[PDB]
Amino acid sequence: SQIPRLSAINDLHKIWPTVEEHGAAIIESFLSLDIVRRLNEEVDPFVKIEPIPAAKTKDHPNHILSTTTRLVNVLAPISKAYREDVLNSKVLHRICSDAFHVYGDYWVLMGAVMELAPSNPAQPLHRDMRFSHPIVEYLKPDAPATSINFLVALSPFTAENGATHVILGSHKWQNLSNVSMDATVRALMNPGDALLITDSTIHCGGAETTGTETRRLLTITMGISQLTPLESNLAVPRPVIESLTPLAQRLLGWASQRSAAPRDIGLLTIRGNSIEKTMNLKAEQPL
Amino acid sequence: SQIPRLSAINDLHKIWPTVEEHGAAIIESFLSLDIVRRLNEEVDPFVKIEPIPAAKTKDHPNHILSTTTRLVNVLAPISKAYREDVLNSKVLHRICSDAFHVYGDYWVLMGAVMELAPSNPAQPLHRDMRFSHPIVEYLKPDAPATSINFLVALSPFTAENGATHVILGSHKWQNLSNVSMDATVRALMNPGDALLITDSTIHCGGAETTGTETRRLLTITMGISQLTPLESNLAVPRPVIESLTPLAQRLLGWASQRSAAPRDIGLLTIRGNSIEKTMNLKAEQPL
Numbered sequence: 001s002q003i004p005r006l007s008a009i010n011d012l013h014k015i016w017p018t019v020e021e022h023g024a025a026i027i028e029s030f031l032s033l034d035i036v037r038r039l040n041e042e043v044d045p046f047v048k049i050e051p052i053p054a055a056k057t058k059d060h061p062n063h064i065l066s067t068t069t070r071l072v073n074v075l076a077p078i079s080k081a082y083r084e085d086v087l088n089s090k091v092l093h094r095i096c097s098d099a100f101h102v103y104g105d106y107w108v109l110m111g112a113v114m115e116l117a118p119s120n121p122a123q124p125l126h127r128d129m130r131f132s133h134p135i136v137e138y139l140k141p142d143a144p145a146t147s148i149n150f151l152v153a154l155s156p157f158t159a160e161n162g163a164t165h166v167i168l169g170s171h172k173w174q175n176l177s178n179v180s181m182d183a184t185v186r187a188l189m190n191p192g193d194a195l196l197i198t199d200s201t202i203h204c205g206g207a208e209t210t211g212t213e214t215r216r217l218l219t220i221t222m223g224i225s226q227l228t229p230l231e232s233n234l235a236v237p238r239p240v241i242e243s244l245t246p247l248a249q250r251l252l253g254w255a256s257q258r259s260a261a262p263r264d265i266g267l268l269t270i271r272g273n274s275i276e277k278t279m280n281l282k283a284e285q286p287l
Numbered sequence: 288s289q290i291p292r293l294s295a296i297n298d299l300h301k302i303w304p305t306v307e308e309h310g311a312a313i314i315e316s317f318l319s320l321d322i323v324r325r326l327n328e329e330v331d332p333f334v335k336i337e338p339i340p341a342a343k344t345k346d347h348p349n350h351i352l353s354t355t356t357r358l359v360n361v362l363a364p365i366s367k368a369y370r371e372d373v374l375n376s377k378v379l380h381r382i383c384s385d386a387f388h389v390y391g392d393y394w395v396l397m398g399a400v401m402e403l404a405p406s407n408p409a410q411p412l413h414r415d416m417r418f419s420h421p422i423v424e425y426l427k428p429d430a431p432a433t434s435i436n437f438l439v440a441l442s443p444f445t446a447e448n449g450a451t452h453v454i455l456g457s458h459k460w461q462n463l464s465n466v467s468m469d470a471t472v473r474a475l476m477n478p479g480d481a482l483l484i485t486d487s488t489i490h491c492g493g494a495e496t497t498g499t500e501t502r503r504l505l506t507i508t509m510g511i512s513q514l515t516p517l518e519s520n521l522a523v524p525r526p527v528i529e530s531l532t533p534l535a536q537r538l539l540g541w542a543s544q545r546s547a548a549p550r551d552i553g554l555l556t557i558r559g560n561s562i563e564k565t566m567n568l569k570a571e572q573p574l
């Protein structure tokens with residue numbers, strides 16, 4: 001059984017139900033090739049200057065990722081395409097509201113460009129969030145997913161160049177005795193296609209076997225506003241924040257958040273008032 | 288069986304183990320009377336100007352609290368005593384590190400002064416966090432507490448003036464069929480004493496029966512850094528933040544946070560570096 005493939009345009013309402021059932025779906029043309037081109041051009045130099053994940057200069061080193069991986073997060077100040085087009089994606093917001101309605105508001109836990117160098121080895125089969133959110137392992141087995149990951153192709157994803165592996169149905173597994181690469185299928189994708197998985201989907205980066213190809217992806221971990229993001233937008237200039245839509249501001253934590261509790265008292269509030277009301281935060285003011 | 292009473296000075300190591308077992312403990316002299324006096328003087332006018340919890344001017348109204356309740360949160364910009372003495376409390380930090388070591392770093396989910404007017408009615412018996420963090424209800428029954436609440440007396444707590452009710456052992460209850468005021472005992476406290484409960488302890492504010500007395504408390508909900516605070520310090524002037532200790536800065540979300548994962552990749556980071564390193568955030572710079 002291959003990963004279900006759905007149109008971002010025509011199959012929008014089917015995307016979350018498909019992931020809830022199978023643990024994975026390919027969203028064809030999640031981003032237009034124009035958005036992919038602009039995002040690639042904007043992040044290009046930041047990928048080139050990025051040190052190894054566990055660089056000795058870093059006070060929060062990533063000791064997990066391969067030395068042939070470059071990860072660049074906090075994309076809002078880097079990329080106009082990201083903070084305007086991606087953060088306001090109609091498809092992303094329909095899927096996230098479908099997924100997280102039981103919990104309430106959602107925001108970006110991490111938006112990162114990942115670039116894998118030629119001959120990058122396959123990652124071990126894993127669930128996400130286990131190096132940042134221990135709390136997730138204490139959730140009841142059948143608890144609705146508290147985060148999902150859009151793995152957006154910024155270059156071709158082929159079997160040969162290390163396309164992502166997923167185990168379909170593995171998001172519902174309690175016993176992990178049958179976890180093996182034998183159980184996996186591949187996310188073959190054109191640039192702009194996205195693999196959508198949950199925080200419980202067992203998956204891994206594939207082995208780069210050509211020895212010539214550089215694979216790049218945009219990973220958008222969307223999570224309930226009750227969970228702390230892996231990344232901070234606290235240092236993003238206020239002029240950049242005030243250039244965004246109110247919705248994009250909320251996704252970067254520059255707004256108060258609401259739970260789905262019938263008489264919700266809210267998150268990141270200030271004496272009964274929102275961040276945006278208190279700070280008089282402007283929106284859609286061009287730079 | 289009455290609520291166990293412990294000295295902040297002499298019984299420090301016994302406090303968290305006592306709450307883990309019984310679901311509640313009284314910390315005698317948690318704050319000195321001097322700190323209580325200074326905090327009361329500093330918040331006094333902010334309590335007086337505070338509207339009803341569900342005021343029509345508020346875009347995050349609290350529809351739960353009685354109209355005879357005034358709640359003032361985001362205390363850092365209001366109170367020197369709070370941001371210096373309370374946020375750096377040796378007793379608070381030992382208890383929180385004892386409670387949350389399985390999860391990692393902790394911070395303030397809410398620090399609020401609550402003032403109850405004369406003849407304030409008893410609250411319904413409840414667990415905290417159910418109007419802000421639906422995720423907590425999806426945790427496995429025996430999951431370690433992800434938040435605890437220091438209910439610090441800023442005035443006398445008597446049976447007559449509505450001292451808090453707790454059900455001892457109720458933090459371990461799955462079946463709530465035996466929940467009744469018949470099962471409760473009272474937190475009788477002098478100013479500076481604190482009632483410590485978990486997010487699972489069944490408790491309620493008591494009925495004010497004198498018709499003359501105003502009861503005031505400082506409620507400090509301490510929670511794992513993986514859960515989003517009820518309140519935001521985003522609007523607190525940077526000069527005020529830079530006057531605090533690095534530890535106080537972390538508690539207000541003006542620092543990156545760490546999980547207890549052996550190879551933790553951190554929370555609120557910026558491309559492998561902390562908020563404080565990135566923003567060049569100064570500490571202990573007097574105003």
Ligand SMILES: COc1ccc(/C=C2/C(=O)Nc3ccccc3C(=O)N2C)cc1
Nearest residue numbers: 064065066123124126128129130131219
């Ligand atoms: C080589 O083996 C691995 C490498 C990574 C993971 C998983 C994570 C993670 O939990 N979260 C994310 C989410 C998006 C992108 C990257 C990461 C990441 O950095 N790590 C560490 C597991 C196994």
Ligand SMILES: COc1ccc(/C=C2/C(=O)Nc3ccccc3C(=O)N2C)cc1
Nearest residue numbers: 351352353410411413415416417418506
């Ligand atoms: C009248 O009945 C009530 C009133 C309050 C609660 C509980 C909460 C809550 O979950 N969190 C806190 C934590 C500290 C102080 C106040 C509150 C608060 O405002 N509410 C609503 C329950 C029942």
Ligand SMILES: O=C(O)CCC(=O)C(=O)O
Nearest residue numbers: 128163164203204205206
């Ligand atoms: O490289 C990939 O396709 C997946 C990367 C990943 O799953 C991860 O780093 O968590």
Ligand SMILES: O=C(O)CCC(=O)C(=O)O
Nearest residue numbers: 415450451490491492493
């Ligand atoms: O009034 C009290 O002592 C307790 C208040 C409380 O439990 C609450 O508001 O959540």
Ligand code: NI
Nearest residue numbers: 126127128203
């Ligand atoms: Ni992963």
Ligand code: NI
Nearest residue numbers: 413414415490
């Ligand atoms: Ni309460």
